[PDB]
Design a protein around this ligand. Structure first.
Ligand SMILES: [Ca+2]
Ligand SMILES: [Zn+2]
Ligand SMILES: [Zn+2]
Lengths: 606, 145, 48
């Protein structure tokens, strides 16, 4: 401790004075830091946030300057532990509140799935969301992300459950590597299927052993990997989406009265599927908010019938259960002895199934599983697994989203193409039916125009892809009986069908692709040269060196805001400060005026 | 080293004509353009290869009797009696044909697979010709611009 | 150009007032500000 250059002799002897001397000249430093560090850490953090407040309020005082050099000598330990938020409320001025950030919270924020959730939220809030509901979406994202972090940190009857739980946890933790291993095994199986040949009799001929059984081994391994991927997804990401839906429906019940006064429409299948379990037993299973039922009862009971509310919201004939639990409640209760199964609620289970089967990602994984199963029958169905890269990469996802983007326009322009091709087909069937002789010797003429359906099929199949109209493939007129009309027919065809409509379709896809790419790069540029919370701009902070970067990493950090919300939730209220209680009241009343809209500490003070 | 190798084979002095591409400004611009969208170009070429492989597999399975690239024979030069040969033939002919793949292989002219063959060719001439090649062309031209 | 003119007309009807045309950001201060301003204060149906 004296040669590590971090202690002077006085400090070394003072710390040796704290020794134990357990009759053998020995201390256990484990015990030492287990006893002498935690309260020291807590009170040091308190005095550290005090000195930080004093500094960042009152600058440029030499006495405070030496106090501040000592402060920062302490702060070199408490830098990743204190977070600062810029609230705007209760004083019409920007207030820098300070709070504690847990190491467990930092780790769960470092976790991967929260990072992908964060990038997805950023993307879909900068692209679709504007500024009216930006703070709404941000608070919703913070709630979903703290639930994600709780789940990630969570990641005879005492012999199988305790092991299968660990198995599910391992699958949820190893979901992504399972996906990459699946893509590897699919690439390997498709390479082996590429090394193939034919005799009517299928045979892997281009090899000499060591390749036929490995195909089946890789097939069964790919299938088990698909099953493991699906099972891990069902316990890693399904809790999140079901929590999001539970939160949405519970807040719609409480605030708006969606199934109390404002019954949903006929086409919103989401409304009906939520009405399915607005009255189940364990309705808020993941929203951690198990009193929304009583809340909506107290809110809409004295106007629409307390009995009707308790009937349509579940928990029937229990309007006095609150009083029964408040006065002489039951201590506990054993699970069962004759009922080992069927304890779960079949309605809520069916609702969870119906909600996960419309997730648009569990559906993709189920398609992956069924394609593997069908490949077990016919090995060539493992080629559909090569499209996994299209969803795994970013630019290929962009190409697919582009081919889906201009959907209605693409369908309508293809329809106009079909109609104009049908017009040309009808006029050719009427007048120019003797030129469609697709034969060289015959002598049986293969007239492609002696039938409307055949002529229309031939047209829309040959004239659109010929690249030069339709007359470069059927016989030239060379006769002054219809040559001018035939010529006009072909130039009009090569105009409207080839160099116009196909060009318009090509431009539709390419412009959709370009627009998607431009939206992505614009989201990136806005995240790089504009603040998320306030959005004052970049040039205002481009005055001191590293100004905007420090402003975005210290003052207006989204991670800091999320950690502050988590701290307020786990703060054990009646201990909140003034600003903390104010922000908590605003968050409970769902107002969000405490976010700095168009001002900050630097714009408010010196 | 190109000059030294040209001392062995005089035709290696043709690589020295690319010095103008580095000496001028707009040719340096064209080269920097062909190198600019590197990752995007590689990925779109990969997607082209994958969709061509999809068409190759479906043609090898179903429409293998139309790939007879012979005029008199009588030995049929079946370009589809092999996966690697059919994939090579596809990615070599159908991408550069400018009009899909069916303008170079025999027409169905028979109500046993004509509609599926027609759909195959319009889908090919769509996705491979007037989409993916167009996207690649646009990538280079937009990088240059 | 025709498509861009159509979408520009749509964007001007969505993010700009018809009568006064002060703009959108001025009313984007209170919640639902521009929508209430266009549906209550400066409604073309109201003027008619
Ligand atoms: Ca208090
Ligand atoms: Zn800011
Ligand atoms: Zn107005």
């Amino acid at each position: 401790m004296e040669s590590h250059k971090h202690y002077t002799q006085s400090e070394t002897e003072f710390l040796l004075s704290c020794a134990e001397t357990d009759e053998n000249e020995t201390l256990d430093y484990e015990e030492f830091v287990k006893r002498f560090h935690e309260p020291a850490k807590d009170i040091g953090f308190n005095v550290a946030v005090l000195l930080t407040n004093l500094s960042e309020h009152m600058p440029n005082d030499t006495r405070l300057q030496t106090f501040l050099e000592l402060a920062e000598s302490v702060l070199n330990y408490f830098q990743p532990f204190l977070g600062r938020i810029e609230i705007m409320g209760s004083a019409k001025r920007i207030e820098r509140v300070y709070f504690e950030i847990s190491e467990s919270s930092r780790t769960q924020w470092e976790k991967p799935q929260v990072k992908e959730s964060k990038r997805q939220f950023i993307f879909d809030v900068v692209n679709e969301g504007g500024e009216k509901e930006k703070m709404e979406l941000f608070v919703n994202f913070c709630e979903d992300t703290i639930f994600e972090m709780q789940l990630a940190a969570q990641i005879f009857w005492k012999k199988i459950i305790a092991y299968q739980q660990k198995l599910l946890n391992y699958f949820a933790r190893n979901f992504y590597n399972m996906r990459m291993l699946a893509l590897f095994v699919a690439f390997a199986i498709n390479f082996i299927l590429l090394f193939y040949k034919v005799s009517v009799h299928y045979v892997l001929e281009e090899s000499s052993g060591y390749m036929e059984p490995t195909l089946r081994i890789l097939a069964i391994l790919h299938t088990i990997i698909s099953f493991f991927c699906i099972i891990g997804y069902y316990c890693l990401k399904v809790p999140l989406v079901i929590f999001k839906r539970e939160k949405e429906v519970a807040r719609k019940l409480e605030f708006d009265g969606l199934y109390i006064t404002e019954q949903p429409s006929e086409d919103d299948i989401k409304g009906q599927w939520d009405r399915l379990v607005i009255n189940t037993q364990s309705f808020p299973n993941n929203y951690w908010d198990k009193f929304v039922k009583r809340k909506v009862m107290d809110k809409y009971g004295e106007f629409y019938g307390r009995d009707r509310i308790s009937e349509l919201l579940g928990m029937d004939k229990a309007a006095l259960d609150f009083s029964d639990a408040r006065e002489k409640k039951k201590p506990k209760k054993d699970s069962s002895l004759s009922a080992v199964l069927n304890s779960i609620d079949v309605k809520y289970q069916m609702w969870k199934l119906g909600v996960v089967f419309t997730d648009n990602s569990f559906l993709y994984l189920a398609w992956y599983m069924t394609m593997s199963v069908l490949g077990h029958y016919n090995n060539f169905f493992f080629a559909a697994h090569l499209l996994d890269i299209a969803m795994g990469f970013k630019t290929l996802r962009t190409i697919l989203s582009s081919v889906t983007h201009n959907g209605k326009q693409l369908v309508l322009t293809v329809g106009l193409l079909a109609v104009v091709v049908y017009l040309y087909t009808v006029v050719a069937f009427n007048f120019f039916r003797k030129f469609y002789n697709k034969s060289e010797d015959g002598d049986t003429p293969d007239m492609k125009c002696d039938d409307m359906l055949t002529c229309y099929m031939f047209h829309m199949y040959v004239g659109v892809r010929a690249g030069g109209g339709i007359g470069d493939e059927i016989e030239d007129p060379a006769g002054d009986e219809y040559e001018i009309y035939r010529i006009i027919f072909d130039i009009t065809f090569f105009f409207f069908v080839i160099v116009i409509l196909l060009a318009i379709i090509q431009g539709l896809i390419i412009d959709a692709f370009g627009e998607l790419r431009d939206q992505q790069e614009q989201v990136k540029e806005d995240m790089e040269t504009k603040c998320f919370i306030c959005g004052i701009g970049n040039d205002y902070f481009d005055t001191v060196p590293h100004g905007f970067e420090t402003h975005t990493l210290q003052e207006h950090n989204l991670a800091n805001y999320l950690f502050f919300l988590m701290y307020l939730i786990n703060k054990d209220e009646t201990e909140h400060t003034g600003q903390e209680s104010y922000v908590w009241k605003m968050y409970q009343e769902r107002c969000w005026e405490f976010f700095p809209a168009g001002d900050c500490f630097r714009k408010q003070y010196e």
